[PDB]
Amino acid sequence: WXAXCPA
Amino acid sequence: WXAXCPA
Amino acid sequence: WXAXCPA
Amino acid sequence: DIAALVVDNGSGMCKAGFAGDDAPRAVFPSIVGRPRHQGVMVGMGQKDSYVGDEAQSKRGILTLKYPIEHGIVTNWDDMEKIWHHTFYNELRVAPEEHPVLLTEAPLNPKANREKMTQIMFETFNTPAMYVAIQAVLSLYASGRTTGIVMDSGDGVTHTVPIYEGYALPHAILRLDLAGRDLTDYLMKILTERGYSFTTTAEREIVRDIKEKLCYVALDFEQEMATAASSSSLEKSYELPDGQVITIGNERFRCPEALFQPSFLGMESCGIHETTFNSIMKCDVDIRKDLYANTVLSGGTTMYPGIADRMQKEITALAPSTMKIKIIAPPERKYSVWIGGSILASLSTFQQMWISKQEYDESGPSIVHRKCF
Amino acid sequence: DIAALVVDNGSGMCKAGFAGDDAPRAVFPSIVGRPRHQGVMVGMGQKDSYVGDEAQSKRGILTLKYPIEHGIVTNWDDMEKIWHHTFYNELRVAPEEHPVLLTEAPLNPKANREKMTQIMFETFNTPAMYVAIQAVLSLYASGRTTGIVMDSGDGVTHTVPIYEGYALPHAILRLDLAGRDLTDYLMKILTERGYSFTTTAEREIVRDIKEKLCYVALDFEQEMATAASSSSLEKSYELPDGQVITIGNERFRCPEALFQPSFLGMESCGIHETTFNSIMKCDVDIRKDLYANTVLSGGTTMYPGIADRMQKEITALAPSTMKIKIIAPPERKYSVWIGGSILASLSTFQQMWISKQEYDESGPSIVHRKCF
Amino acid sequence: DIAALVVDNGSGMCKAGFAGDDAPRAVFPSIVGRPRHQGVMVGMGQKDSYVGDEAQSKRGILTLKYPIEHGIVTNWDDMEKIWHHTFYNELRVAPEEHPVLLTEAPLNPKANREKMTQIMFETFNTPAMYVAIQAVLSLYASGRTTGIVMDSGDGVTHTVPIYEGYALPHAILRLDLAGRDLTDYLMKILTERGYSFTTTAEREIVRDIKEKLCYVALDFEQEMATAASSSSLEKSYELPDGQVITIGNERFRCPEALFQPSFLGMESCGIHETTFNSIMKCDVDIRKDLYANTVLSGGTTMYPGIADRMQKEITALAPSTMKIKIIAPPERKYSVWIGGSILASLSTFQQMWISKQEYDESGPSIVHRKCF
Amino acid sequence: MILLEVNNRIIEETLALKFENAAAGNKPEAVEVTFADFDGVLYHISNPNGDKTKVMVSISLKFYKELQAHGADELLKRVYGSFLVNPESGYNVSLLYDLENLPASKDSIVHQAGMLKRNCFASVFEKYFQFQEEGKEGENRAVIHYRDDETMYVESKKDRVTVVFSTVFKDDDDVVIGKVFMQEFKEGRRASHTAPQVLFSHREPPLELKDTDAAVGDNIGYITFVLFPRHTNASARDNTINLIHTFRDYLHYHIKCSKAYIHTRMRAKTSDFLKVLNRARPDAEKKEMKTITGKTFSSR
Numbered sequence A, B, C: 001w002x003a004x005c006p007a
Numbered sequence D, E, F: 001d002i003a004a005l006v007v008d009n010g011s012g013m014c015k016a017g018f019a020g021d022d023a024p025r026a027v028f029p030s031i032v033g034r035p036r037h038q039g040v041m042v043g044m045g046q047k048d049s050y051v052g053d054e055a056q057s058k059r060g061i062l063t064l065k066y067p068i069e070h071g072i073v074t075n076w077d078d079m080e081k082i083w084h085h086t087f088y089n090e091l092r093v094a095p096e097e098h099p100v101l102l103t104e105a106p107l108n109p110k111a112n113r114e115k116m117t118q119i120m121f122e123t124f125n126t127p128a129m130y131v132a133i134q135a136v137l138s139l140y141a142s143g144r145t146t147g148i149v150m151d152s153g154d155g156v157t158h159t160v161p162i163y164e165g166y167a168l169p170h171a172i173l174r175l176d177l178a179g180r181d182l183t184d185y186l187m188k189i190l191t192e193r194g195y196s197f198t199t200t201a202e203r204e205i206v207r208d209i210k211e212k213l214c215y216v217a218l219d220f221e222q223e224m225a226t227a228a229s230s231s232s233l234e235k236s237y238e239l240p241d242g243q244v245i246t247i248g249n250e251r252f253r254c255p256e257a258l259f260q261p262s263f264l265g266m267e268s269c270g271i272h273e274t275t276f277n278s279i280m281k282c283d284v285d286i287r288k289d290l291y292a293n294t295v296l297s298g299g300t301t302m303y304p305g306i307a308d309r310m311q312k313e314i315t316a317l318a319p320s321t322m323k324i325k326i327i328a329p330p331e332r333k334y335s336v337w338i339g340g341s342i343l344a345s346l347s348t349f350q351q352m353w354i355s356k357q358e359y360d361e362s363g364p365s366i367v368h369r370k371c372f
Numbered sequence G: 001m002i003l004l005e006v007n008n009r010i011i012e013e014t015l016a017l018k019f020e021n022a023a024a025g026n027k028p029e030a031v032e033v034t035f036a037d038f039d040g041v042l043y044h045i046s047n048p049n050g051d052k053t054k055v056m057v058s059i060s061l062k063f064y065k066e067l068q069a070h071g072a073d074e075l076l077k078r079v080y081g082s083f084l085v086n087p088e089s090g091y092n093v094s095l096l097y098d099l100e101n102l103p104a105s106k107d108s109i110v111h112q113a114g115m116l117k118r119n120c121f122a123s124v125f126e127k128y129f130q131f132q133e134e135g136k137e138g139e140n141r142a143v144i145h146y147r148d149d150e151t152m153y154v155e156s157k158k159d160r161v162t163v164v165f166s167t168v169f170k171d172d173d174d175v176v177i178g179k180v181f182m183q184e185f186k187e188g189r190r191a192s193h194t195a196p197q198v199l200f201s202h203r204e205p206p207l208e209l210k211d212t213d214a215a216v217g218d219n220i221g222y223i224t225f226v227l228f229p230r231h232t233n234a235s236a237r238d239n240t241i242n243l244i245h246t247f248r249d250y251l252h253y254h255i256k257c258s259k260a261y262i263h264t265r266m267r268a269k270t271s272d273f274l275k276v277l278n279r280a281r282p283d284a285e286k287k288e289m290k291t292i293t294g295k296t297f298s299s300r
Ligand SMILES: Nc1ncnc2c1ncn2[C@@H]1O[C@H](COP(=O)(O)OP(=O)(O)O)[C@@H](O)[C@H]1O
Pocket: D008, D009, D010, D011, D012, D013, D014, D153, D154, D155, D156, D179, D180, D207, D210, D211, D212, D214, D298, D299, D300, D301, D302, D303, D304, D333, D334
């Protein structure tokens, strides 16, 4: 992901 | 709640 | 170590 | 001097104070936090659980739980701790020295207020207590004797018409749709941009985002087209780690769920139709007086431009000869408490408490006979 | 011409085949390998980047990267390489002669599927394409119309209930917890015994151990007490250099994370509570049917003894009157692909493809309205 | 109060002292020497195993063996010899009368601490012991209960983040890369100049060269281009036999391996990226407090200009609004011991011992219950 | 242990020991063991007239008269077969095991011998379960004096079985904590989607106790269970009988463990107050380092 978690 | 919905 | 790396 | 305590004790934010003031003394989120790790450092703050602002400050290493859900207490071992922290840590006053004025949403399980009375009398030994409906206190704070209150509480929305001080208990409407549901909806729709918020410490950040950037649209389709055609409606927010997010179209889609529950997969109708139906439930000869005295309340009606949307919707619904006037004071976030500080301070009210000996005689079921 | 391609390009393993078949033509790990040492032998078949089985075989001198992680595509160049190797090498068929049906986990950043469409129409130049929720396809494969499906791939777990063909989009739950995280937890807990697997090449060995020795315990505390008072639970695995290791207690502590994410420091609930909550999110009248039609899916649900554990947990959560039936098919590794094939081979589906002209007319964003 | 021996005994150098002081009483390299030639001069007294400083002084005729490698005890007889020399020769105290606080790196095999407890209870008959994690003690020594400790010893590097005392055990990153690997790498790169150190007695000379001349370059490529274009970085060191050698480019090429292990042919990330990853694995609400409380320790972080390099490298990976503080005290080498003396001198620590009686009834399996 | 168990340990132990001694072929030795149980029950395992080959297990109960009523021995007979003999003088029920005619699988008869009190109770209780199963309204409703100052009023209707516990505790501390433990007993039906309707009352007795002699008063509490045909069917009535049988003893047990629970929190708070006092002791300038034993260090 972009915010929260990686991906 | 007890029946219907959570609470 | 036992598996991986020496130690 | 000795005066009754007024404890709002909402679903999302506990507000307590002394009667006779114009502002709550203590305001803090009604959450309980417990650590989910194991300390390793000797002697450094090893305690069972944090409550209130202390839990918000240390929310990184705790799991936060709300005791009240949809206006209903679902964990009494935590509600007791909330009230204990209110009495001995926030107000810092003995509980058995002042009467208490609690609030409860209408159309609620009788067991809720029965247990409220039992806790207030058996545990804290208050000499007197009372459980008033929130919308009635909001109307008292507004400073009038007729109108329809629409308390969009954070945990629960409800409308209670009142005429000349005569509440109509057959036109009251309750809708379990409020700030926490909008927070969850924002968490669900933020994933489209790519921001993933799962844990409760992140739900707090999402609430801080909602409470700051979200706003209600005067016309939904128009705003959607505007946000799609031009990147002039996006806002930037900095998470508490340095990351920066930019939310656009989402801004007015979160509060739009209030007017369209179909987004949240509910069969219910928007708050505008709820208020209109609660008005049409009344007898005709008073409806006009309600149309011109619609009052908002609760922290979920603080969204910018909600008065305009509500007025437009109701004007479209109601006939074209009635004057619609959405009374929205800029202090609505505390109206439910403010009216309390009024009601507990009146001189014609001191004979309506539930005295301790009345309870000792008639059991906790006396709340149904005394409190309306 | 006809028989559109079906490419379940989920995390961990890409599975591609033709429509109308009962098994994927080419299944292979979706990894991109790059050499990490200088070449000294000239003219010996030196290539810049290996993909799939080629990378798995020569993983000794390669660094491996997955282009997908938790369901989102992080490195689009490697993903393009994967798709190219899938089309030309593993299938030997041009992409501009067949439609393609990809897959995607629900609640995914829209940029992901938008870029998927843009790549499929601008690089490989397909005549048509489609994107489907992997859970719906897994339900297609089971030949049902009612039921809840709990898919769990390499990097994503998600539950999607569907009643009479109407998927409830508000009860769909997602949880980033799958093979990848279990393989990391195993790499961590193996150090307890003394085995250290650190580099990305040994992650494959650890994954082979996890998918050969691990098993879900029917009672965690009892199995822990048993494995601590006996040696009947130890199994020996042989590394690919002759070294033999023995793992005991670990065998069931790895999959147990699925039912207790607290091991991984995650706050979220287990997969059993996730499924139960997803069911309880739905309307009352249907909660019965879902109880009798829980359909497991995904490779991560191929652990021996996971059906029994899930059944026990749910029947301990759900009321006693209702019946719990875990529909764990004999094969469920390719169930999503089987459902995709069955869908693509349907005669009523040919009016739901995203046509080339439609993409050229409305751009990539059309994927948000043509696909659900 | 009671006096408790604190024996760090990490890899590389054993540092033992009494709890309550500010510096270890005895610090000596943990090596064991064995004569490799015939004895011809009888009557002068001979020994078959030299330990510590005596083995260092006589290294010309010995085969120095380290009993600990990469933080793991690999030869228990030499470890017992080291402990005996520590107890009866350096401290000159009876071990059967004082508690012992040993240290172990995180994520080591359990057999290590098990055999450590068994040795300390069945050979020296210590009345009580305790096995603490090194980084936690390092944080004790810094006088703060929040921060990420980055301990880089002689055989192992590891980071542990702690918030308000609640250490996060799911974000502890270990990395087998420390002073000994750097010493071997320096031995390798010193050949290209023309000097060849190949025997285990000259590895000590190479280690002295490293810890006297080597340093960390703030900008690696700029320093390379500088030292490769002018003789202004060359330093001359005198061997113990009169020879003088001159090292230039090598000076900062040895420690640079810490920030990019691709030189040693390893795949793992540098120590800066390891610390940043460890931070990013923690929850979002505490990262800002970790960034401003990064702590270094171990004698491998005593390279001139490593704090500035770590700050410049982390600042490039962290958002532009987070303030990065590298708290590197000039007593970093002894920090792990200094925190130990702080811990073993506390009042409540007497309730955390492993009493000899408690072991006599439960065997070595008690350390996993009494010490995390 | 959270839930009290229904099988007595002394009976099982003694009978298993006797059966092991008899099965191995050893000569039988004398046995005379008297003991007690919950609710004032008195057990006596002995030999009839010094006959060292027979072992008689007798039990004296408090619901003396309710078990002598016609039909109150169907379950006892059904479960115990030929072991059921005439009561020993002074006791109420009596089993008689012949150490020479013991059938194989000696575990089952001992497992059913340790539940003698539970079976005597379930025999006088399944009468109303049957009165409700057979579809008859207005069947006999009685008051089992399962203790000496407390009663259990059982009533069977066409569609339900009502059990009203009239209960009172002996000690003052136990009374004060039992008021709480019984007030908070309706908050249990939130732990299961299927739990019998529980009603608590201490202001006034229910309308079921107005024609009967169940103990009433101003210090007694009334707890009404309404067991429906999903708790009294022929497949889940064993658990229901066990729970209705051990309810009062379980409440007493947990009232007496609440104190040992509170003591830990009180010790914690005592230490927390000692830590606040410790701010008054002036920190020493130099301490002499001692040994684990406490003797002088004997070295630097
Ligand atoms: N200015 C605002 N705009 C939008 N939402 C708000 C605003 N202020 C508060 N809220 C939301 O509304 C709720 C506050 O309601 P509140 O008056 O505290 O009622 P309660 O006591 O039931 O929580 C919170 O959930 C908060 O997230």
